[PDB]
Design a protein around this ligand. Structure first.
Ligand SMILES: NC(=O)[C@H]1C=CCN([C@@H]2O[C@H](COP(=O)(O)OP(=O)(O)OC[C@H]3O[C@@H](n4cnc5c(N)ncnc54)[C@H](O)[C@@H]3O)[C@@H](O)[C@H]2O)C1
Ligand SMILES: NC(=O)[C@H]1C=CCN([C@@H]2O[C@H](COP(=O)(O)OP(=O)(O)OC[C@H]3O[C@@H](n4cnc5c(N)ncnc54)[C@H](O)[C@@H]3O)[C@@H](O)[C@H]2O)C1
Ligand SMILES: Cc1cc2nc3c(=O)[nH]c(=O)nc-3n(C[C@H](O)[C@H](O)[C@H](O)COP(=O)(O)O)c2cc1C
Ligand SMILES: Cc1cc2nc3c(=O)[nH]c(=O)nc-3n(C[C@H](O)[C@H](O)[C@H](O)COP(=O)(O)O)c2cc1C
Lengths: 363, 363
């Protein structure tokens, strides 16, 4: 009968509470290298049971959005090391979310104007990515038509994830989270709409799951499976992605990741799920289960109560409330998020959302 | 090659950094029940890798100092539960330090004016405890002559420690720390000067260690040895205690507590130790080693570097600096402690030591 402030063993990592900071792209690293401003922002939020970083590009060709951080260079690694140290000195734990956008990209953001890559050569209908144009302005821009990866290019991407994890581990991260959600590259492989391959990486459920599971295995070699998680979005349609077998894929992956002893599965809610889905997930996967999507303290506690989650992630409320878990403890009113400063810029709408004033703390 | 901000597995508990808050009696619970003021104070310090609570009386006859908290009633337990929740919501971990003063007491602070108890009927020469007099005033007062515990009263004290741990575990503490240091009851058994018993609880090293090891075993039944620690002060003379065999007892206990798989040993420094002592300790005990006594960041890092400690506790600097680990990260100047408000009173000199102002945080 855990509550939001009951400690949780998430794989081999002890969390102090179950109020998790969801991964949140904020697009505040114009040179791709985290710095002091990120030290501040993440440090402010270090009371989170776990911080899951902003999505972090694992290579140049992984990128779809300018001004987002990377984890393929020495300088990027050094920047994250500083951020991690900052989180640790404030009593926190942080996981790096490992990102490759696949088809959700454009030549203009690719290195040397390379074509985006994907399981299959299908443009994401209606999707926009965020590009810097030749004149130095930036903006949302329709994604372009990707090329289908060659079978022999797939190992190289797995290795890009592996090296990202190696860098993450050296930088001091407590965990990594494989981003297989929100219609990014691993999700593109998982989903029937986006994966029309006829090699060993498409067709059947096992084939579609093959590359994502290679990624999980590679990163788990680095961190241990007990310090790896994965984000999944069964039933979510985003960036043109559709899927005829979301439930069956979810159950297959649950069983495969359970065998591997993964620390957690993290579901971002389409919010629907069929009745019984959450119950099945809890039976099929014996590690940590984290759910995200419009939660507040009451709704989160209900999933603890139903034995369908071990913890709950919060996105927009952690943007706006660096001390979200304390606010939930006291039932204190939350700061309102300002969507106009979710992305880009600097400290405004990033590190200037206030903490509670308990009448004793002094700065 | 860990640094102060390198995570540590301390038994089965993950710590975010190695800057530990030492146990600090503050004498701010006149009714023995922790409350909101303690929620604030401990919450302020929750960035500590681990908070080790103020020494907490395990029963009425355990007490030598008025206005200190207890852990033998429902109401005390409820008060600590609130404190623990506060620490968890701020991202912390907290261990309860389990206290029985033995001979360092007086009839005036004992229930119903009972005589203090000890391994042997030896008054602590020069020692003072802190008493409330009949007229309602309070002050330091010379300790009285204890009675030697009967052999058949020793199990009852072990059970008092066990029940304290049961309460602690229900209240949500992450760990307990057996106080066997600073010349309190278990140390009185350990030391040759204070223990002149001729039953199975005195004489030889094994006999003197017998009661303390029963205490460790009882509390470890509750928490698991992986969530128990013990504080020791070999070579320290306090409250009239002397010892002819400090090194030999330390090595015996090291080996016995290693076999038991205890989470950590915590040494409060007489600071001397013989050359080779720390090295021997590291060989003889394979769990966590924590040292305390006048450390700063440089001196602490040196013990990490020498492979003689896994973490270091700080006392007076955590009184004065709620964000001590962050100050060490930045090399920021520390607030100066005010000894005049270490004990007694209320918020002044307790929750009004300021945090750093990073120029971004707002209250
Ligand atoms: N990495 C990810 O998986 C996610 C990135 C953030 C948004 N994520 C999900 O996508 C959809 C659409 O989110 P939203 O409506 O908030 O995004 P926008 O279309 O406005 O912006 C998309 C991206 O465009 C970039 N962007 C957009 N505006 C800016 C500005 N002004 N500066 C810098 N960068 C900007 C930035 O990378 C944003 O993440 C929603 O379901 C979110 O939960 C997913
Ligand atoms: N529980 C413990 O093991 C410790 C309690 C705190 C002090 N501890 C060690 O004892 C010695 C002497 O410490 P100090 O000089 O700081 O203590 P005092 O003699 O002034 O006070 C002793 C106790 O007396 C009580 N005291 C003393 N003054 C007050 C006031 N004004 N209000 C309430 N209570 C008071 C309170 O419990 C104090 O802990 C030193 O080596 C410390 O590291 C040990
Ligand atoms: C500003 C913004 C940025 C986000 N960036 C990411 C991201 O980097 N990776 C990811 O997996 N999801 C990302 N998301 C989705 C969030 O992690 C989260 O799942 C979503 O906002 C729903 O939770 P909420 O209702 O509590 O905000 C983002 C959402 C927003 C609002
Ligand atoms: C105000 C005060 C209260 C203390 N209370 C305790 C206590 O409850 N239990 C304990 O084991 N030691 C206690 N000590 C000792 C500290 O834990 C610590 O070992 C000592 O202060 C030396 O470390 P420092 O030099 O970093 O302050 C206390 C010390 C002071 C200054």
């Amino acid at each position: 009968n855990p509550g939001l402030f009951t400690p949780l063993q998430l794989g081999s990592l002890s969390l102090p509470n179950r109020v998790i900071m969801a991964p949140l792209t904020r697009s505040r690293t114009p040179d791709s290298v985290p710095g002091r401003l990120q030290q501040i922002y993440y440090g402010q939020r270090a009371s989170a049971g776990l911080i899951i970083s902003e999505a972090t590009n694992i290579s140049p060709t992984a990128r779809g959005y300018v001004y987002t951080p990377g984890i393929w260079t020495d300088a990027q690694e050094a920047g994250w090391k500083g951020v991690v140290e900052a989180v640790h000195a404030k009593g926190g734990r942080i996981a790096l979310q490992l990102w490759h956008v696949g088809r959700v990209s454009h030549e203009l953001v690719q290195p040397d104007g390379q074509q985006p890559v994907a399981p299959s050569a299908l443009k994401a209908e209606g999707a926009e990515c965020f590009v810097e144009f030749e004149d130095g302005t930036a903006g949302l821009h329709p994604t372009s038509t990707p090329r289908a990866l060659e079978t022999d290019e797939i190992p190289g991407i797995v290795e890009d994830y592996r090296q990202a994890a190696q860098r993450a581990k050296r930088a001091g991260f407590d965990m990594v989270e494989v981003h297989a959600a929100n219609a990014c590259l691993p999700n593109q492989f998982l989903a029937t709409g986006t994966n029309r391959r006829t090699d060993q990486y498409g067709g059947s459920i096992e084939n579609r799951a093959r590359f994502p599971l290679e990624v999980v295995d590679a990163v788990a070699e680095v961190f241990g499976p007990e310090r790896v998680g994965i984000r999944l979005t069964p039933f979510l349609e985003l960036f043109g992605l559709t899927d005829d077998e979301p439930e069956a894929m979810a159950f297959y992956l649950a069983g495969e990741l359970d065998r591997r002893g993964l620390a957690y599965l993290h579901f971002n809610e389409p919010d629907t799920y069929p009745e019984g889905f959450r119950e099945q997930m809890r039976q099929r996967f014996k590690g940590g289960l984290i759910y995200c999507g419009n939660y507040d303290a009451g709704r989160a506690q209900a999933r603890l109560d139903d034995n369908t989650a071990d913890a709950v992630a919060f996105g927009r409320p952690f943007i706006a409330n660096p001390d979200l878990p304390e606010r939930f403890r006291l039932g204190a009113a939350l700061n309102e998020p300002d969507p106009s400063t979710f992305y880009g810029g600097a400290e405004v709408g990033y590190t200037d959302y206030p903490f509670l004033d308990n009448g004793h703390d002094r700065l």
